[PDB]
Design a protein around this ligand. Structure first.
Ligand SMILES: O=P(O)(O)C(c1ccccc1)P(=O)(O)O
Length: 105
């Protein structure tokens, strides 16, 4: 039950997620989950990053959900819920630009 989640922003655009994440106050790993704009039934994990090369910037990762039940970004690493996916990526960066740290204000 994902809508209950404070990091779940629902139906907002890619541009809007970037407006929110590009705030100078945001540390690396600030994030939110939103609906994909054009992939039905898919979500998008939008995450802030920072480096001296690019400065503050944003990356988007597609989250797939199977009818069979699993949620994932990479099929090799699946979760029983979106909440568990978020908790896992708050500990492991794996292939993300940064581990998830703080919910986007
Ligand atoms: O789902 P798409 O529409 O292809 C798109 C997207 C691209 C990359 C990751 C997640 C979603 P966005 O939602 O338009 O940013």
């Amino acid at each position: 039950s994902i809508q209950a989640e404070e990091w779940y922003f629902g139906k907002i655009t890619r541009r809007e997620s970037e407006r929110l994440l590009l705030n100078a106050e945001n540390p690396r790993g600030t994030f939110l989950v939103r609906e994909s704009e054009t992939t039905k039934g898919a979500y998008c994990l939008s995450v802030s990053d920072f480096d001296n090369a690019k400065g503050l910037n944003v990356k988007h990762y597609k989250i797939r959900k199977l009818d069979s039940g699993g949620f994932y970004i990479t099929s090799r690493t699946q979760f029983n819920s979106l909440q568990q996916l978020v908790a896992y990526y708050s500990k492991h960066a794996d292939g993300l630009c940064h581990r998830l740290t703080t919910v986007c204000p």
